[PDB]
Amino acid sequence: KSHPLMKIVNNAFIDLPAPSNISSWWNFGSLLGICLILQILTGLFLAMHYTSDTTTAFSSVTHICRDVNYGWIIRYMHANGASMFFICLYMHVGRGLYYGSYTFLETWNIGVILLLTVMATAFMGYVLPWGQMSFWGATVITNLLSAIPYIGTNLVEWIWGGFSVDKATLTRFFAFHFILPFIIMAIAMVHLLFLHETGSNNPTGISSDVDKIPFHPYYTIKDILGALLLILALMLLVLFAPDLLGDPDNYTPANPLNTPPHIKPEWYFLFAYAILRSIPNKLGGVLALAFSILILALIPLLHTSKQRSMMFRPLSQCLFWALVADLLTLTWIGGQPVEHPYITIGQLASVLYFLLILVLMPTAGTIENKLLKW
Amino acid sequence: WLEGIRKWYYNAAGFNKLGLMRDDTIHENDDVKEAIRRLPENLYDDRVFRIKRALDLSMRQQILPKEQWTKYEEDKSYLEPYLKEVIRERKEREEWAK
Amino acid sequence: RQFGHLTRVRHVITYSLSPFEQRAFPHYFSKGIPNVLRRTRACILRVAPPFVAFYLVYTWGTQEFEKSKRKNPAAYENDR
Amino acid sequence: PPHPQDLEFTRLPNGLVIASLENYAPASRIGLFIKAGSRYENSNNLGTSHLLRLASSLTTKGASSFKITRGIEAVGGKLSVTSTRENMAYTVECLRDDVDILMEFLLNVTTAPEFRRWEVAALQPQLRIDKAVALQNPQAHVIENLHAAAYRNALANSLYCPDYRIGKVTPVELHDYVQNHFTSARMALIGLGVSHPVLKQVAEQFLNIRGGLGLSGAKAKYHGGEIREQNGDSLVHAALVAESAAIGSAEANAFSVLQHVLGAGPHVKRGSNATSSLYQAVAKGVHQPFDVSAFNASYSDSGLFGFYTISQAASAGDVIKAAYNQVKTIAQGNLSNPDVQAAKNKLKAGYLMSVESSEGFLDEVGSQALAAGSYTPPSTVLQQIDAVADADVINAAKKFVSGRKSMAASGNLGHTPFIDEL
Amino acid sequence: DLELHPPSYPWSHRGLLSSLDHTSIRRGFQVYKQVCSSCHSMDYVAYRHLVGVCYTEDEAKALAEEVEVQDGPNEDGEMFMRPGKLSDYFPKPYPNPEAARAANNGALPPDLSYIVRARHGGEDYVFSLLTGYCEPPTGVSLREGLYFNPYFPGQAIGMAPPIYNEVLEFDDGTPATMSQVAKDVCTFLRWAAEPEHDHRKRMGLKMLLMMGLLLPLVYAMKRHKWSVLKSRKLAYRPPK
Amino acid sequence: LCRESLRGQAAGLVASVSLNVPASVRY
Amino acid sequence: SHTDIKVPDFSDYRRPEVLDSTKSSKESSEARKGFSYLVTATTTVGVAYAAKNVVSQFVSSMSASADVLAMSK
Amino acid sequence: PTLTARLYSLLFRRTSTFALTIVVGALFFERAFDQGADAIYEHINEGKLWKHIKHKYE
Amino acid sequence: ATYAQALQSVPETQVSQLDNGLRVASEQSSQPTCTVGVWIDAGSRYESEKNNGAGYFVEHLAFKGTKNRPGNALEKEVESMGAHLNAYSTREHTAYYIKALSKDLPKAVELLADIVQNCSLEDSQIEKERDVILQELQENDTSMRDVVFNYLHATAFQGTPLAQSVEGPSENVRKLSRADLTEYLSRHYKAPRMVLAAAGGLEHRQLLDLAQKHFSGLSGTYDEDAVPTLSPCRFTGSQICHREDGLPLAHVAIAVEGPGWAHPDNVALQVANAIIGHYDCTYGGGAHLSSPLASIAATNKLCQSFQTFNICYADTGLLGAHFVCDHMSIDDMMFVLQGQWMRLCTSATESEVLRGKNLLRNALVSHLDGTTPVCEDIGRSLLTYGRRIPLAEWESRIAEVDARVVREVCSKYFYDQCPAVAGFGPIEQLPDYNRIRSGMFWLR
Amino acid sequence: LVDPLTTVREQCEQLEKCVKARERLELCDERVSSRSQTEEDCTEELLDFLHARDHCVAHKLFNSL
Ligand code: HEM
Ligand code: HEM
Ligand SMILES: Cc1nc(CO)c(-c2ccc(Oc3cccc(OC(F)(F)F)c3)cc2)c(O)c1Cl
């Protein structure tokens, strides 16, 4: 007839009541999107020429860069896009943590999920080119599962499809890496679906139903401008510093007989790599590394301040930035070889991480109420 | 003394700069929602506007002139007497179902 | 939930002006930069310490990593 | 100025009146007045008038509900329906070049309405609206009550449908009502800005429907008594009247003069009603916002006369009494010739003015064409006003103060008196 | 376990908009073809790739027909040699890593296609290695076939110092010094590792000018739209 | 609806519904 | 009263050309609109250029590579 | 009228013309920008490019 | 005897002038009663910030007796002779008029002159009317139409005189003293800035001699730079949103800048306003209504009432519409309404124009029925147009208006114009101004 | 023919830190070269020198080319 009825499904895109006062920190979800779609579109066009076979896997990427028309652009846009996505992710999560948005429990948890999936995808993505870091990254990272008692050791080989990270793996890793983005895109819609039950939080942490504005034209134009900047940021990397966030070892084809000197996972993982390397025990390291990401699920149970947002919460406010700085620290420490003093600073940073979230920040919130006669 | 520290922290939290009273920033929740419903036309309609102006301020990223700031001495605890009841009724309702 | 069913608001007047009837960037630097500087002022004591702290520990830990990689003490040491 | 024309007049074989002023206006106004008001509703088919009033422009024989609505508006005409307790007045307006189409559309609505069950049923809840729209005016209640307190049979009927009847009105009852009451012996065709020949030609050919009164009205058996609706408004409305005289009798005139002696209504904007007897008699002893005026109803069958009080909460007791004493001491005969001669002027002018604009004129020509037989030029009425002696006035006042009592009150009625407390 | 990091030699293509020197690429190629094509594979480059960078099609084809490359199989199912053509990838020094190791002192000369990107510091490194060769200081002895280069990690490189003064002579007849060679072969290896370099940076500029144009324009529309909200005034008017 | 100006105020009832003109309670 | 309610003064944020509370706006509107719709038009031109450029790139991605063309001869 | 005012009523008033304007203007723009920034780059990197050292080998 | 010819037999209104300036104006019919009044260019546009609310105060006191007839004599003399006396103030006009019997004309004309000239302004009466008006403003405060209209004026003409209410800020009413009122009166009630209009049974020259009799005695000229000049009032695209949820229905008024009493377009604009029309829930038409907006509104119950308007002033006006509706129908009503504006602007159908033309044709003629109408016309015609205008002329002006013209004319004042919007009540649904503004151009 | 480098090196290792490092290259050299069976080397100090030198070297070597 017209296809007229479900365009009026954009009541949650056009005439959606938005808070008047959400800062640029709310701009990030849009951008995470832009990242997802960009990643998918580029990824498709890479998958047009890439080959998952160990014998041709490197050779393909190179053909993409060198001989495929504009291939290099697509390849780098994908590779830095990957980083942009992760920055956007950490910003996006931070936002939630600072403004308490984690009270939107489902939305939040769906997020916690999304994050893990994106991590998962991006991990596999990095193996695909079959470079030194691609291989040993997978061998080092995956192997950790064989810390799980009894079954882990088999589990790992079931993952690998053999006795080492091999062609058997590389081919399936491509298959998953191709699919996951979509599962992520589906989850995303759930993630949204649960948010617009409640509408967005705002910096104050005070219910904004008294003062709503239509998403269009206000938050559309804001988000176009927001995207524009992410585009600038990406294109700067792609066109000026295409290897900035990249490791050089991965420009030498994988070799299972010769391990690189300083094995590290790509930047957005480092902070957890550090936390894993803090603990001496194999499994301890693994479970610590797990908790390090899973504690996002615990966060909502740890809120104690009678105020929703940190805006009016001095103590918390510091401890938060302390957390960010500690994550930066751990990120730097994870980049360095495990030698003095990095191992101690590693220790203290790691213990600080969990001390902040589990012990300190909840107390800060309590005291903060005591101080306001709550 | 504590009453100095409380006085500092009140001013440090700094919702006052937006012309807000403490009970305007309380985390919305069943008890709170109920208390609020119980509020009288005036006490409600005031809260309405304090928040309505505070949000608008927050959107412009500016604050009120030092004079119109909420004063510690004059900060009404308007929502407290209502809420404490709402709570106690629910505590009673649990106690009974025990 | 949408316009009409959001909440109950009583006795408030909102005056506004057409985007074509007003300036896009009013008192931009005139009123901006001071507000910016007050804003920076407000939060900096809360934001910066953690990062300064990072800056000390970073350079300390790096120069320190550099000491330990250099030569040990040398007044006749690998013998005597 | 132009040269005034003879308001023509014919009375066809079957008692159907036709009148036409050819005043050569650009505007043409045509009314068809029918004796089909509330008074002819029985104790069963109540509201059927009120619905019938809203029911104009529902699909007719020759023109569909659409055709009717779009057709008139295509030339910018107007179809109005004007109901008295006694007379329904289907009155059309347009430019003198479209007269025949507005005429046509009018005759379909009156002589050939179909009243299709699905239209009639879908129009019903309009009654609900149009009623509550009219009952905004606290007067409407008081007046609707007043008649139902005063009379019993015919004029006791409300102009608006009773609540219980809203929705219950059947398409057969409209067929019946129309067939029984839209008859040659109860109809007057009035034309303003149209020649007599065509108004004849149209009425002879297309209005000649069986002219024997299908029902007849009752004789309005006066009861008298009080209705009081306690409803807590800021003010209190209360009307108190008595059995007056019918229209067409020189005794009505007496009440018409007696009215303007007591209270007419505002003549000067913002004024303190200085000349108004009632207002001035209640402009004493009560230091309040208040209002009072002389109510004077006059039908062909009967008539009501008294006063209407819009007083304070607790001032009701005072206003209604004080206004009454003032009428009493007129029945006792405290009435100087200047007071009669002012009132005669107020009525004499007040009349001449009310027929000034074509809208009233037509209603008066129709009114006379139905209630009496012929048109009676202003001069004769103005003369009849002068024919009223100073006796007839004080005798009308006497007939009030002595006559049987009717009262209708609504508001907060805690300090409002009853007929026996008066 | 101690390491010397390269200095910041300022290349003609160093800066954010600065392109490669195609002359120096042209020279640098000859340095590969003469000095290293005998131990260092450059598997990902073919003669055609040179056309329109540092050589004409004719020059490039002439550079191809210079070399015998294998082909086949023919009618009899036998592989046979033929002269190279534009579409041939640079000839390899060995058949395999094992032959490569065994023909050196168990040290395999790494492929040079991506070497500039495969090592920290890049050309600044490669130059510094190539030219930085020196004497082992009192205390350091070495294995035979190992040479001391302070820029290499571990300082014991398996590579015979590959360039000295006048190791070849250039077509344009530039001073065939050592350091003038290293520079040119680095400027080439850079291109080899990143053929897009020049175009990438040209796009960069266009992106810059474009963002420069748009990013205010859009912000302006944002503020044009938001004005209505940023200017507004609220008025509380409760009665009694 | 607002209240004050009452000086011989109520009309002296005619009900009048119509097509165009909004329904009036004259008198 | 509702007539005590007087509109606040926007002469702080107003466009110069409509500052005179005794001069008709109808002149300046012509230019005022044009000016702002210009920003949009240009933004759109730049955007169009931009898009045009990355589209055709991604498209070109799919035509025969210099690799395939090498043999085309 | 000023350039903005005339531009409005001539090109921005009718949404048909507005788009056409954007089209024409984008067409004219593209070449101008391309050609310009190209020449700016080619100057910035003067002498270094194959188009600058081409003539020497023909 | 056609409508074309019917316009011919209309008495051509007669107009004379006095040496002292006062214009005399009259339309003669054989009407036994007649209307006669004084019309004056004075009011809340001529008022200023400090003296706002005075024209109203004078209009109040004017009937509380003069010097020649003290107390309530002026009232009694008019009450007792049968005739009616009325008055009104607006933002641009002031009128004091009497409906009388023809024979009373000479007695009538005299009283008006007394009311205008020899007004008492009793110092005890001022304190009596002060209490009146103060309560008169409380009434308006619960009459949403008035409130929203005053708002519309306020935010449409913000910072100018026109933005001012005729009643004035409650402050002023409580602090206006005789000095202000008398000065206003003397400075504004000038004989060249006045008209004496009459219609019905009377011969022109009878009035003129009565004006020479009683009005020659009025202030007949003016001093040099005291009788003021009118500043054009700047129309500002803006919004005023009184959000009061407690109220049962939402009122909204939206309008673009009109042309002014001056402009010839005011015909084609009226013809256009007629096409979109007007409606309320008691109309018989319902779905079958000719105005798409009306029929939509009716079938869907979008509103319980809406009316288009062209309020006119000297060099500017308000051209738009008002609706009253349920707290959930505002957006839709707005959308249908703007939709109609745009559809008119871009594609007015030919016949639907002819529908307007006739509606207006009817409007003006059936408007000028009585004396009270025609006197009021003649009184104002001279105060605005400078003449009175023939129905046969208005007819000529209308008969020229066709689709192309309606389009050009609507497109002139609507298409891509910033409107002024006043909203009062449960208006949480009322669209954002950025959105409403987008309802004025192409289509989404 | 002689190398632009082999000049700019001589010209560079003039500067105070070069000679200062080279000095301790001999000062640590006594340390090691004079003793019997010790396993130290002056690599570190050679690199200490070479760095200080080549920083300079790089600063201008390229002007010759
Ligand atoms: C979901 C978000 C995505 C992320 C975070 C992501 C991440 C990555 C990363 C980090 C790489 C390595 C890039 C490199 O070093 O060159 C990569 C490679 C690749 N990705 Fe993705 N990817 C995403 C989506 C997709 C999608 C949807 C597809 C296919 C439809 C895809 C196909 C590929 C292919 C073929 C490669 C190999 C080419 C190469 O080496 O660059 N990716 N991905
Ligand atoms: C695929 C990655 C992600 C996408 C595409 C995504 C998308 C979105 C979008 C579009 C919004 C609304 C705009 C905004 O308010 O920022 C949103 C809100 C939110 N997301 Fe995400 N999200 C992602 C990851 C996450 C993660 C990792 C978390 C937490 C673990 C999370 C938690 C939230 C929360 C709490 C909100 C609402 C907070 C608020 O309204 O202020 N999301 N998400
Ligand atoms: C508060 C707030 N809310 C929402 C949605 O409720 C959005 C928002 C706006 C536009 C959006 O459009 C998109 C575009 C691409 C992907 C997308 O997602 C996905 F992946 F499809 F689920 C959403 C998605 C979300 C926003 O930008 C802000 Cl600031």
mmCIF file of C-alpha atoms and ligand atoms in Angstrom, chain A residues 35-36 39-48 50 57 61 64 75-76 78-83 85-86 118 121-130 134 174 177-182 184 250 266 268, ligand 1:
data_model
loop_
_atom_site.group_PDB
_atom_site.id
_atom_site.type_symbol
_atom_site.label_atom_id
_atom_site.label_comp_id
_atom_site.label_asym_id
_atom_site.label_seq_id
_atom_site.Cartn_x
_atom_site.Cartn_y
_atom_site.Cartn_z
ATOM 1 C CA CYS A 35 31.597 1.899 14.420
ATOM 2 C CA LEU A 36 29.571 -1.314 14.197
ATOM 3 C CA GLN A 39 33.237 -2.192 10.723
ATOM 4 C CA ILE A 40 30.608 -4.418 9.055
ATOM 5 C CA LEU A 41 30.641 -2.577 5.717
ATOM 6 C CA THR A 42 34.494 -2.494 5.545
ATOM 7 C CA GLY A 43 34.780 -6.054 6.874
ATOM 8 C CA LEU A 44 32.489 -7.294 4.118
ATOM 9 C CA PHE A 45 34.698 -5.637 1.488
ATOM 10 C CA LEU A 46 37.793 -7.160 3.067
ATOM 11 C CA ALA A 47 36.098 -10.577 3.149
ATOM 12 C CA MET A 48 35.547 -10.029 -0.585
ATOM 13 C CA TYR A 50 40.694 -12.223 2.161
ATOM 14 C CA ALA A 57 46.130 -15.832 4.604
ATOM 15 C CA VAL A 61 45.932 -9.237 3.061
ATOM 16 C CA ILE A 64 44.306 -6.391 -0.599
ATOM 17 C CA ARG A 75 41.871 -2.511 5.553
ATOM 18 C CA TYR A 76 43.139 0.375 7.676
ATOM 19 C CA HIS A 78 38.729 -1.510 9.508
ATOM 20 C CA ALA A 79 41.837 -1.834 11.736
ATOM 21 C CA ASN A 80 41.678 1.655 13.306
ATOM 22 C CA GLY A 81 37.883 1.510 13.259
ATOM 23 C CA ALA A 82 38.404 -1.469 15.571
ATOM 24 C CA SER A 83 40.274 0.847 17.983
ATOM 25 C CA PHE A 85 35.048 1.273 18.554
ATOM 26 C CA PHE A 86 36.950 0.306 21.727
ATOM 27 C CA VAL A 118 32.882 -7.047 20.728
ATOM 28 C CA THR A 121 35.055 -10.526 17.778
ATOM 29 C CA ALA A 122 37.994 -8.096 17.822
ATOM 30 C CA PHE A 123 40.221 -10.811 19.289
ATOM 31 C CA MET A 124 39.433 -13.190 16.410
ATOM 32 C CA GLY A 125 39.667 -10.386 13.857
ATOM 33 C CA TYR A 126 43.299 -9.816 14.867
ATOM 34 C CA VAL A 127 44.274 -13.481 14.186
ATOM 35 C CA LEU A 128 42.948 -13.423 10.600
ATOM 36 C CA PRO A 129 46.001 -11.873 8.887
ATOM 37 C CA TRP A 130 48.264 -14.713 10.262
ATOM 38 C CA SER A 134 48.266 -12.813 15.219
ATOM 39 C CA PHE A 174 37.168 -16.153 10.267
ATOM 40 C CA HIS A 177 34.539 -13.193 13.162
ATOM 41 C CA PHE A 178 32.228 -12.857 10.149
ATOM 42 C CA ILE A 179 29.090 -13.847 12.120
ATOM 43 C CA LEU A 180 29.490 -12.246 15.590
ATOM 44 C CA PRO A 181 29.041 -8.595 14.453
ATOM 45 C CA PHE A 182 25.527 -9.535 13.471
ATOM 46 C CA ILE A 184 26.125 -8.001 18.315
ATOM 47 C CA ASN A 250 52.433 -8.687 12.792
ATOM 48 C CA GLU A 266 46.512 -5.208 21.212
ATOM 49 C CA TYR A 268 42.418 -2.228 24.406
HETATM 50 C C1 HEM K 1 32.277 -6.109 14.860
HETATM 51 C C2 HEM K 1 33.213 -5.156 14.812
HETATM 52 C C3 HEM K 1 34.460 -5.562 14.129
HETATM 53 C C4 HEM K 1 35.656 -5.538 14.763
HETATM 54 C C5 HEM K 1 35.865 -4.891 16.109
HETATM 55 C C6 HEM K 1 36.608 -6.172 13.921
HETATM 56 C C7 HEM K 1 37.961 -6.262 14.268
HETATM 57 C C8 HEM K 1 38.927 -6.712 13.401
HETATM 58 C C9 HEM K 1 40.318 -6.544 13.569
HETATM 59 C C10 HEM K 1 41.016 -5.910 14.748
HETATM 60 C C11 HEM K 1 40.930 -7.076 12.485
HETATM 61 C C12 HEM K 1 42.414 -7.109 12.206
HETATM 62 C C13 HEM K 1 42.643 -5.897 11.291
HETATM 63 C C14 HEM K 1 44.068 -5.813 10.840
HETATM 64 O O1 HEM K 1 44.973 -5.857 11.699
HETATM 65 O O2 HEM K 1 44.325 -5.690 9.621
HETATM 66 C C15 HEM K 1 39.927 -7.555 11.618
HETATM 67 C C16 HEM K 1 40.180 -8.141 10.403
HETATM 68 C C17 HEM K 1 39.161 -8.574 9.571
HETATM 69 N N1 HEM K 1 37.830 -8.464 9.757
HETATM 70 FE FE1 HEM K 1 37.004 -7.581 11.216
HETATM 71 N N2 HEM K 1 36.003 -6.619 12.811
HETATM 72 C C18 HEM K 1 34.703 -6.301 12.854
HETATM 73 C C19 HEM K 1 33.717 -6.592 11.912
HETATM 74 C C20 HEM K 1 33.922 -7.349 10.753
HETATM 75 C C21 HEM K 1 32.929 -7.856 9.876
HETATM 76 C C22 HEM K 1 31.439 -7.625 10.001
HETATM 77 C C23 HEM K 1 33.566 -8.617 8.882
HETATM 78 C C24 HEM K 1 33.003 -9.293 7.682
HETATM 79 C C25 HEM K 1 31.767 -9.080 7.229
HETATM 80 C C26 HEM K 1 34.955 -8.548 9.175
HETATM 81 C C27 HEM K 1 35.916 -9.167 8.427
HETATM 82 C C28 HEM K 1 37.262 -9.050 8.702
HETATM 83 C C29 HEM K 1 38.277 -9.586 7.786
HETATM 84 C C30 HEM K 1 38.075 -10.323 6.490
HETATM 85 C C31 HEM K 1 39.463 -9.290 8.321
HETATM 86 C C32 HEM K 1 40.818 -9.664 7.754
HETATM 87 C C33 HEM K 1 41.443 -8.543 6.925
HETATM 88 C C34 HEM K 1 42.600 -7.889 7.657
HETATM 89 O O3 HEM K 1 43.600 -8.568 8.020
HETATM 90 O O4 HEM K 1 42.561 -6.657 7.897
HETATM 91 N N3 HEM K 1 35.122 -7.840 10.334
HETATM 92 N N4 HEM K 1 38.702 -7.327 12.209
#
